[PDB]
Tab-separated table of N, CA and C and ligand atoms in Angstrom:
chain	number	residue	atom	x	y	z
A	1	UNK	N	81.828	-77.626	14.097
A	1	UNK	CA	83.842	-76.839	14.142
A	1	UNK	C	83.556	-77.927	14.936
A	2	UNK	N	85.014	-78.496	15.612
A	2	UNK	CA	85.375	-79.421	16.478
A	2	UNK	C	87.148	-79.927	16.103
A	3	UNK	N	87.786	-80.601	16.581
A	3	UNK	CA	89.047	-81.254	16.515
A	3	UNK	C	89.116	-82.425	17.353
A	4	UNK	N	90.008	-83.453	16.892
A	4	UNK	CA	90.313	-84.750	18.065
A	4	UNK	C	91.983	-84.061	17.964
A	5	UNK	N	92.467	-84.081	19.575
A	5	UNK	CA	94.307	-83.847	20.348
A	5	UNK	C	93.546	-85.204	20.986
A	6	UNK	N	95.061	-85.943	20.321
A	6	UNK	CA	96.023	-86.738	20.576
A	6	UNK	C	97.375	-86.617	20.334
A	7	UNK	N	98.103	-86.969	22.199
A	7	UNK	CA	99.155	-86.337	22.719
A	7	UNK	C	99.941	-85.301	21.562
A	8	UNK	N	100.385	-85.262	20.904
A	8	UNK	CA	101.029	-83.260	20.258
A	8	UNK	C	100.835	-83.155	19.172
A	9	UNK	N	99.161	-83.316	19.414
A	9	UNK	CA	98.821	-83.228	16.788
A	9	UNK	C	97.085	-82.837	17.587
A	10	UNK	N	96.833	-82.183	16.530
A	10	UNK	CA	95.863	-81.402	16.738
A	10	UNK	C	95.227	-81.467	14.912
A	11	UNK	N	93.847	-82.992	15.602
A	11	UNK	CA	92.877	-83.514	14.117
A	11	UNK	C	92.100	-82.879	13.647
A	12	UNK	N	91.782	-81.842	12.576
A	12	UNK	CA	90.752	-81.200	11.352
A	12	UNK	C	90.884	-80.748	10.231
A	13	UNK	N	89.020	-80.397	10.256
A	13	UNK	CA	88.506	-80.611	9.092
A	13	UNK	C	90.119	-79.400	8.183
A	14	UNK	N	90.506	-79.840	7.108
A	14	UNK	CA	90.881	-79.142	6.211
A	14	UNK	C	90.877	-77.474	6.303
A	15	UNK	N	90.015	-77.974	4.990
A	15	UNK	CA	88.528	-76.580	4.992
A	15	UNK	C	88.595	-75.449	6.713
A	16	UNK	N	89.456	-76.440	7.146
A	16	UNK	CA	88.804	-75.476	8.727
A	16	UNK	C	89.861	-74.543	9.617
A	17	UNK	N	90.869	-75.017	9.381
A	17	UNK	CA	92.288	-75.140	9.667
A	17	UNK	C	92.150	-73.025	9.833
A	18	UNK	N	93.152	-73.423	11.288
A	18	UNK	CA	93.240	-72.571	10.959
A	18	UNK	C	94.940	-71.666	10.376
A	19	UNK	N	95.067	-69.907	10.561
A	19	UNK	CA	96.707	-69.511	10.649
A	19	UNK	C	97.985	-70.471	11.549
A	20	UNK	N	97.693	-70.492	12.535
A	20	UNK	CA	98.260	-71.477	13.714
A	20	UNK	C	98.288	-72.420	13.122
A	21	UNK	N	97.476	-73.392	12.651
A	21	UNK	CA	97.408	-75.224	11.804
A	21	UNK	C	98.199	-75.101	10.386
A	22	UNK	N	97.774	-74.086	10.289
A	22	UNK	CA	99.205	-74.184	8.421
A	22	UNK	C	100.755	-73.660	9.117
A	23	UNK	N	100.687	-72.819	10.051
A	23	UNK	CA	102.425	-72.641	10.550
A	23	UNK	C	103.312	-73.797	11.148
A	24	UNK	N	102.089	-74.546	12.152
A	24	UNK	CA	102.444	-75.551	13.171
A	24	UNK	C	101.947	-76.934	11.771
A	25	UNK	N	102.117	-76.745	11.071
A	25	UNK	CA	101.617	-78.284	10.581
A	25	UNK	C	102.320	-79.738	10.517
A	26	UNK	N	101.891	-80.983	9.878
A	26	UNK	CA	102.900	-81.691	10.261
A	26	UNK	C	101.911	-82.461	9.067
A	27	UNK	N	100.426	-82.577	8.544
A	27	UNK	CA	100.534	-83.651	7.285
A	27	UNK	C	99.372	-82.924	6.891
A	28	UNK	N	99.070	-82.838	5.795
A	28	UNK	CA	97.500	-82.516	4.890
A	28	UNK	C	96.925	-83.265	4.278
A	29	UNK	N	95.705	-83.168	4.000
A	29	UNK	CA	95.449	-84.343	2.495
A	29	UNK	C	93.675	-83.512	2.004
A	30	UNK	N	94.222	-83.335	0.906
A	30	UNK	CA	93.065	-81.617	0.308
A	30	UNK	C	91.902	-82.528	-0.019
A	31	UNK	N	92.212	-84.614	-0.881
A	31	UNK	CA	91.057	-85.083	-0.595
A	31	UNK	C	90.769	-86.120	0.377
A	32	UNK	N	91.996	-85.913	1.914
A	32	UNK	CA	91.186	-86.367	2.306
A	32	UNK	C	89.492	-85.520	3.258
A	33	UNK	N	90.482	-84.517	3.259
A	33	UNK	CA	89.990	-83.128	3.583
A	33	UNK	C	90.393	-82.725	5.279
A	34	UNK	N	91.451	-83.237	6.141
A	34	UNK	CA	92.321	-83.301	6.917
A	34	UNK	C	93.739	-82.540	6.320
A	35	UNK	N	93.746	-81.918	8.300
A	35	UNK	CA	94.980	-81.277	8.482
A	35	UNK	C	95.522	-81.609	9.732
A	36	UNK	N	96.315	-81.793	10.075
A	36	UNK	CA	97.141	-82.390	11.130
A	36	UNK	C	98.403	-81.314	11.557
A	37	UNK	N	98.065	-80.584	13.259
A	37	UNK	CA	99.346	-79.939	13.096
A	37	UNK	C	99.912	-79.659	15.175
A	38	UNK	N	100.920	-78.950	14.999
A	38	UNK	CA	101.261	-80.210	16.390
A	38	UNK	C	100.902	-79.048	17.584
A	39	UNK	N	100.980	-79.592	18.777
A	39	UNK	CA	100.477	-78.581	19.954
A	39	UNK	C	101.732	-78.692	21.141
A	40	UNK	N	101.480	-77.819	22.074
A	40	UNK	CA	102.347	-77.084	22.666
A	40	UNK	C	101.742	-78.826	24.047
A	41	UNK	N	100.857	-79.118	24.601
A	41	UNK	CA	100.228	-79.611	24.898
A	41	UNK	C	99.332	-80.888	24.949
A	42	UNK	N	99.521	-81.368	25.583
A	42	UNK	CA	98.980	-83.679	25.553
A	42	UNK	C	97.944	-83.149	25.364
A	43	UNK	N	97.410	-84.071	24.367
A	43	UNK	CA	95.874	-84.508	24.188
A	43	UNK	C	95.168	-85.684	24.917
A	44	UNK	N	94.287	-85.487	24.834
A	44	UNK	CA	93.527	-87.008	25.856
A	44	UNK	C	92.802	-87.828	24.701
A	45	UNK	N	92.341	-88.076	23.446
A	45	UNK	CA	92.005	-88.107	22.728
A	45	UNK	C	92.320	-90.058	22.826
A	46	UNK	N	91.763	-90.778	22.282
A	46	UNK	CA	92.344	-92.054	22.078
A	46	UNK	C	92.141	-92.388	20.447
A	47	UNK	N	92.461	-93.033	19.096
A	47	UNK	CA	92.197	-92.995	18.036
A	47	UNK	C	92.282	-94.252	18.461
A	48	UNK	N	90.533	-94.813	18.129
A	48	UNK	CA	90.694	-96.441	17.643
A	48	UNK	C	91.659	-97.172	16.483
A	49	UNK	N	91.414	-98.197	16.620
A	49	UNK	CA	92.497	-99.224	15.815
A	49	UNK	C	91.435	-99.717	15.604
A	50	UNK	N	90.455	-100.421	15.080
A	50	UNK	CA	89.878	-101.084	14.801
A	50	UNK	C	88.828	-100.997	12.903
A	51	UNK	N	88.232	-102.079	12.997
A	51	UNK	CA	87.255	-101.921	11.336
A	51	UNK	C	86.172	-101.887	11.997
A	52	UNK	N	85.394	-100.938	12.811
A	52	UNK	CA	83.849	-101.304	13.735
A	52	UNK	C	83.854	-100.455	12.687
A	53	UNK	N	82.541	-100.433	12.139
A	53	UNK	CA	81.510	-100.442	11.505
A	53	UNK	C	79.698	-99.708	12.245
A	54	UNK	N	79.953	-100.244	13.767
A	54	UNK	CA	79.155	-98.712	13.788
A	54	UNK	C	79.137	-97.734	15.081
A	55	UNK	N	78.794	-96.818	15.567
A	55	UNK	CA	78.936	-95.779	16.214
A	55	UNK	C	77.936	-94.222	16.484
A	56	UNK	N	78.297	-93.329	17.014
A	56	UNK	CA	77.750	-92.246	17.556
A	56	UNK	C	78.816	-91.173	17.629
A	57	UNK	N	78.160	-90.058	16.913
A	57	UNK	CA	78.529	-89.105	16.293
A	57	UNK	C	77.486	-88.219	16.321
A	58	UNK	N	78.779	-86.510	16.937
A	58	UNK	CA	77.584	-85.683	18.068
A	58	UNK	C	77.719	-85.208	16.201
A	59	UNK	N	76.030	-84.089	16.284
A	59	UNK	CA	75.411	-83.713	15.097
A	59	UNK	C	75.240	-82.192	16.397
A	60	UNK	N	76.424	-80.707	16.203
A	60	UNK	CA	76.054	-79.731	16.456
A	60	UNK	C	74.189	-78.652	15.966
A	61	UNK	N	74.228	-78.604	15.045
A	61	UNK	CA	72.272	-78.516	14.295
A	61	UNK	C	71.615	-79.480	15.293
A	62	UNK	N	72.001	-80.449	15.713
A	62	UNK	CA	70.993	-80.853	16.535
A	62	UNK	C	71.317	-80.735	18.583
A	63	UNK	N	71.832	-81.114	18.225
A	63	UNK	CA	72.788	-80.950	19.525
A	63	UNK	C	72.479	-82.242	20.451
A	64	UNK	N	72.485	-83.374	19.639
A	64	UNK	CA	72.084	-84.612	20.068
A	64	UNK	C	73.970	-85.316	19.510
A	65	UNK	N	74.063	-86.207	19.844
A	65	UNK	CA	74.588	-87.599	19.452
A	65	UNK	C	73.811	-88.304	19.343
A	66	UNK	N	73.740	-89.645	17.873
A	66	UNK	CA	73.263	-90.016	17.179
A	66	UNK	C	74.614	-92.135	17.909
A	67	UNK	N	73.611	-92.599	17.405
A	67	UNK	CA	74.213	-94.067	16.668
A	67	UNK	C	73.753	-94.297	15.695
A	68	UNK	N	74.835	-94.086	15.046
A	68	UNK	CA	74.933	-94.809	13.257
A	68	UNK	C	75.531	-96.127	12.828
A	69	UNK	N	75.495	-96.676	11.719
A	69	UNK	CA	75.820	-97.884	11.162
A	69	UNK	C	76.380	-96.590	10.162
A	70	UNK	N	77.989	-97.262	9.686
A	70	UNK	CA	78.600	-96.334	8.497
A	70	UNK	C	79.568	-97.494	7.657
A	71	UNK	N	79.861	-97.295	5.936
A	71	UNK	CA	80.361	-98.026	5.873
A	71	UNK	C	82.200	-97.478	5.966
A	72	UNK	N	82.561	-98.730	5.224
A	72	UNK	CA	84.310	-98.412	5.588
A	72	UNK	C	85.284	-97.302	4.553
A	73	UNK	N	86.034	-97.075	5.266
A	73	UNK	CA	86.250	-95.621	4.518
A	73	UNK	C	86.494	-96.411	2.773
A	74	UNK	N	86.438	-95.553	2.037
A	74	UNK	CA	85.730	-94.957	0.829
A	74	UNK	C	86.005	-93.742	-0.266
A	75	UNK	N	87.175	-94.172	-1.421
A	75	UNK	CA	87.032	-93.410	-2.560
A	75	UNK	C	85.711	-92.452	-2.625
A	76	UNK	N	85.039	-91.969	-2.960
A	76	UNK	CA	83.241	-91.324	-3.029
A	76	UNK	C	83.949	-90.090	-3.841
A	77	UNK	N	82.572	-89.686	-4.770
A	77	UNK	CA	82.273	-88.419	-5.393
A	77	UNK	C	81.521	-87.868	-4.500
A	78	UNK	N	81.945	-87.129	-4.331
A	78	UNK	CA	81.243	-85.429	-3.128
A	78	UNK	C	81.073	-84.554	-4.133
A	79	UNK	N	79.813	-83.705	-4.087
A	79	UNK	CA	79.619	-81.979	-4.907
A	79	UNK	C	79.599	-81.162	-4.586
A	80	UNK	N	79.883	-80.797	-5.175
A	80	UNK	CA	80.494	-79.244	-4.987
A	80	UNK	C	79.979	-78.090	-3.485
A	81	UNK	N	80.418	-77.678	-2.885
A	81	UNK	CA	80.003	-76.903	-2.071
A	81	UNK	C	81.270	-75.888	-2.306
A	82	UNK	N	81.019	-74.733	-0.479
A	82	UNK	CA	80.926	-73.306	-0.736
A	82	UNK	C	83.159	-73.687	-0.272
A	83	UNK	N	83.946	-74.617	-0.270
A	83	UNK	CA	84.881	-75.394	0.175
A	83	UNK	C	85.980	-75.951	-0.811
A	84	UNK	N	85.196	-76.810	-1.592
A	84	UNK	CA	85.657	-77.771	-2.723
A	84	UNK	C	84.726	-77.842	-3.542
A	85	UNK	N	85.566	-77.394	-5.082
A	85	UNK	CA	84.732	-77.866	-6.316
A	85	UNK	C	84.240	-79.750	-6.200
A	86	UNK	N	83.625	-80.044	-7.132
A	86	UNK	CA	82.753	-81.148	-6.977
A	86	UNK	C	83.716	-82.649	-7.653
A	87	UNK	N	84.196	-83.455	-6.284
A	87	UNK	CA	84.929	-83.900	-7.261
A	87	UNK	C	85.661	-85.060	-6.140
A	88	UNK	N	86.196	-86.348	-5.991
A	88	UNK	CA	86.554	-87.659	-5.745
A	88	UNK	C	88.123	-87.344	-3.941
A	89	UNK	N	86.328	-87.525	-2.563
A	89	UNK	CA	86.892	-87.439	-1.907
A	89	UNK	C	87.271	-89.119	-0.875
A	90	UNK	N	88.955	-89.502	-0.959
A	90	UNK	CA	89.365	-90.900	-0.848
A	90	UNK	C	88.778	-91.014	1.124
A	91	UNK	N	88.950	-91.986	1.810
A	91	UNK	CA	89.092	-93.005	3.077
A	91	UNK	C	86.986	-91.823	4.036
A	92	UNK	N	86.852	-91.895	3.236
A	92	UNK	CA	85.222	-91.629	3.316
A	92	UNK	C	84.306	-92.781	4.247
A	93	UNK	N	83.937	-92.603	5.040
A	93	UNK	CA	82.425	-93.195	5.759
A	93	UNK	C	81.390	-92.898	5.201
A	94	UNK	N	79.998	-93.498	5.047
A	94	UNK	CA	79.196	-92.588	4.904
A	94	UNK	C	78.258	-93.207	6.292
A	95	UNK	N	76.883	-92.701	6.309
A	95	UNK	CA	75.235	-92.956	7.614
A	95	UNK	C	74.929	-92.129	6.476
A	96	UNK	N	73.238	-92.635	7.548
A	96	UNK	CA	72.501	-92.077	7.936
A	96	UNK	C	71.916	-91.950	7.990
A	97	UNK	N	72.052	-89.907	7.976
A	97	UNK	CA	71.725	-88.949	9.588
A	97	UNK	C	71.604	-87.438	8.970
A	98	UNK	N	71.904	-86.854	10.317
A	98	UNK	CA	71.136	-85.654	9.620
A	98	UNK	C	72.847	-84.802	9.566
A	99	UNK	N	72.692	-83.872	9.051
A	99	UNK	CA	74.320	-83.449	9.181
A	99	UNK	C	74.137	-81.773	7.805
A	100	UNK	N	74.635	-80.688	8.356
A	100	UNK	CA	74.793	-79.036	7.981
A	100	UNK	C	75.997	-78.878	7.524
A	101	UNK	N	76.271	-77.891	6.496
A	101	UNK	CA	78.387	-77.444	6.157
A	101	UNK	C	78.471	-77.530	7.653
A	102	UNK	N	77.749	-76.492	8.872
A	102	UNK	CA	78.930	-76.633	9.674
A	102	UNK	C	79.163	-77.718	11.131
A	103	UNK	N	78.624	-78.533	10.505
A	103	UNK	CA	78.436	-79.650	11.618
A	103	UNK	C	79.887	-80.749	11.314
A	104	UNK	N	80.521	-79.765	10.300
A	104	UNK	CA	81.970	-80.505	10.537
A	104	UNK	C	83.249	-80.277	11.490
A	105	UNK	N	83.746	-81.470	11.997
A	105	UNK	CA	84.570	-81.298	12.870
A	105	UNK	C	83.843	-82.451	14.567
A	106	UNK	N	82.394	-83.017	13.825
A	106	UNK	CA	81.991	-83.618	14.860
A	106	UNK	C	82.316	-84.931	14.859
A	107	UNK	N	82.857	-85.082	16.011
A	107	UNK	CA	83.631	-87.018	16.394
A	107	UNK	C	82.771	-88.133	16.453
A	108	UNK	N	83.264	-89.174	15.249
A	108	UNK	CA	82.269	-90.379	15.220
A	108	UNK	C	83.810	-91.119	16.635
A	109	UNK	N	82.429	-91.989	17.187
A	109	UNK	CA	82.938	-92.782	18.526
A	109	UNK	C	83.103	-94.010	18.290
A	110	UNK	N	83.578	-95.266	18.720
A	110	UNK	CA	83.378	-96.417	18.495
A	110	UNK	C	83.548	-97.108	19.963
A	111	UNK	N	83.421	-98.178	20.454
A	111	UNK	CA	83.769	-98.880	21.825
A	111	UNK	C	85.698	-98.456	21.882
A	112	UNK	N	86.201	-97.593	20.148
A	112	UNK	CA	87.859	-98.082	20.818
A	112	UNK	C	88.029	-97.133	20.692
A	113	UNK	N	87.692	-95.479	20.340
A	113	UNK	CA	87.934	-94.819	21.110
A	113	UNK	C	87.875	-94.078	19.433
A	114	UNK	N	88.115	-92.512	19.247
A	114	UNK	CA	88.494	-92.167	17.840
A	114	UNK	C	88.226	-92.468	16.763
A	115	UNK	N	86.640	-92.231	15.452
A	115	UNK	CA	86.567	-93.195	14.136
A	115	UNK	C	86.571	-91.990	13.196
A	116	UNK	N	86.359	-90.993	13.147
A	116	UNK	CA	86.999	-89.792	12.962
A	116	UNK	C	85.982	-89.406	13.040
A	117	UNK	N	85.957	-87.607	11.954
A	117	UNK	CA	85.174	-86.660	12.428
A	117	UNK	C	84.548	-86.444	11.322
A	118	UNK	N	83.182	-85.620	10.666
A	118	UNK	CA	82.710	-85.374	10.098
A	118	UNK	C	82.971	-84.717	8.928
A	119	UNK	N	82.268	-85.192	8.391
A	119	UNK	CA	83.292	-83.934	6.956
A	119	UNK	C	82.346	-83.740	5.572
A	120	UNK	N	81.364	-83.675	4.875
A	120	UNK	CA	80.885	-84.453	3.716
A	120	UNK	C	79.304	-84.976	5.129
A	121	UNK	N	77.557	-84.520	3.495
A	121	UNK	CA	76.231	-84.060	3.954
A	121	UNK	C	75.688	-84.038	3.163
A	122	UNK	N	74.749	-83.814	3.867
A	122	UNK	CA	73.313	-83.699	2.803
A	122	UNK	C	72.141	-84.339	2.588
A	123	UNK	N	71.880	-84.349	1.875
A	123	UNK	CA	70.362	-85.030	1.814
A	123	UNK	C	69.523	-86.320	2.993
A	124	UNK	N	70.000	-86.172	3.421
A	124	UNK	CA	69.586	-86.792	4.693
A	124	UNK	C	71.340	-88.191	5.136
A	125	UNK	N	72.441	-87.726	4.449
A	125	UNK	CA	72.937	-88.537	4.858
A	125	UNK	C	74.240	-88.088	5.276
A	126	UNK	N	75.620	-88.280	6.307
A	126	UNK	CA	76.632	-88.291	6.807
A	126	UNK	C	77.955	-88.337	6.162
A	127	UNK	N	78.554	-88.032	5.815
A	127	UNK	CA	80.022	-88.306	6.085
A	127	UNK	C	81.334	-88.103	7.146
A	128	UNK	N	82.876	-89.796	6.918
A	128	UNK	CA	83.068	-88.419	8.355
A	128	UNK	C	84.642	-88.713	7.469
A	129	UNK	N	85.478	-88.272	7.732
A	129	UNK	CA	86.819	-89.166	7.637
A	129	UNK	C	87.119	-89.556	8.728
A	130	UNK	N	87.884	-90.474	7.720
A	130	UNK	CA	88.307	-91.376	8.928
A	130	UNK	C	90.074	-90.976	9.208
A	131	UNK	N	90.086	-91.378	9.950
A	131	UNK	CA	91.957	-91.156	11.159
A	131	UNK	C	92.461	-93.357	11.536
A	132	UNK	N	91.738	-94.282	11.755
A	132	UNK	CA	91.936	-94.424	12.454
A	132	UNK	C	93.624	-96.006	11.614
A	133	UNK	N	93.474	-95.262	10.468
A	133	UNK	CA	94.982	-95.790	9.462
A	133	UNK	C	95.785	-95.011	10.252
A	134	UNK	N	95.453	-92.944	10.597
A	134	UNK	CA	97.074	-92.975	10.329
A	134	UNK	C	97.442	-92.876	12.648
A	135	UNK	N	98.953	-94.302	11.732
A	135	UNK	CA	99.067	-95.202	13.025
A	135	UNK	C	100.099	-94.393	13.580
A	136	UNK	N	100.894	-92.884	13.061
A	136	UNK	CA	101.929	-91.924	14.034
A	136	UNK	C	101.025	-91.293	14.266
A	137	UNK	N	99.709	-91.152	14.617
A	137	UNK	CA	99.479	-90.554	15.383
A	137	UNK	C	99.809	-90.366	16.996
A	138	UNK	N	99.935	-92.266	17.169
A	138	UNK	CA	100.183	-92.711	18.137
A	138	UNK	C	101.279	-92.548	19.196
A	139	UNK	N	102.526	-91.592	19.012
A	139	UNK	CA	104.178	-92.002	18.488
A	139	UNK	C	104.532	-90.663	18.455
A	140	UNK	N	105.536	-90.330	18.399
A	140	UNK	CA	107.296	-89.146	18.931
A	140	UNK	C	105.509	-88.081	18.397
B	1	LIG	C1	75.750	-77.967	-1.890
B	1	LIG	O1	77.054	-78.911	-0.521
B	1	LIG	C2	76.994	-78.195	0.056
B	1	LIG	C3	77.021	-78.473	1.217
B	1	LIG	O2	78.251	-77.982	2.271
B	1	LIG	N1	76.766	-79.232	2.102
B	1	LIG	C4	77.344	-80.552	2.986
B	1	LIG	C5	76.384	-80.590	4.592
B	1	LIG	CL1	75.301	-80.164	3.187
B	1	LIG	C6	76.778	-81.163	4.691
B	1	LIG	C7	77.752	-81.290	5.455
B	1	LIG	C8	78.503	-82.056	6.494
B	1	LIG	C9	78.740	-81.001	4.746
B	1	LIG	C10	78.198	-80.163	3.533
B	1	LIG	O3	79.035	-80.031	1.542
B	1	LIG	C11	80.905	-79.625	2.697
B	1	LIG	C12	81.267	-78.571	3.531
B	1	LIG	C13	82.511	-78.755	3.618
B	1	LIG	C14	83.508	-79.480	2.831
B	1	LIG	C15	83.031	-80.836	2.744
B	1	LIG	C16	84.113	-81.756	2.029
B	1	LIG	N2	84.337	-82.555	2.713
B	1	LIG	O4	84.199	-81.740	0.801
B	1	LIG	C17	81.689	-80.900	1.695
B	2	LIG	ZN1	86.393	-100.059	17.188
């Protein structure tokens, strides 16, 4: 579990969105596993605006923050899970690292701020849904 709080927005994994998130929906994309909803109070997270390929992510199944190298956002085939059938997930970055289903929502951060959240993984890998291209998160 986990979320990004930026301005008047809440960024969560789409498969973990609550009834409040859907009722207060701003934007969602099933192929990216992302959902953004409106908030009453302001958040303090800063979204990175960069092309960094090194950062640190939080792994709840280990209670640890790991330094990782990751690929640039891409269209990647992701196997069937409890939440989605086997499909191509877009804007996805991969790193070699530990991850379990309940690790989704763990933040990946670089020196510039939040890069994304844990969205896919298994077999020694971890995948993160990029949020650095969502420029509108920084305004209105
Ligand atoms: C057979 O793999 C099922 C599974 O739950 N693997 C998995 C494992 Cl180990 C680890 C993680 C972090 C995610 C994982 O899968 C999911 C779960 C929720 C959503 C998505 C998606 N966005 O397509 C992918
Ligand atoms: Zn950066």
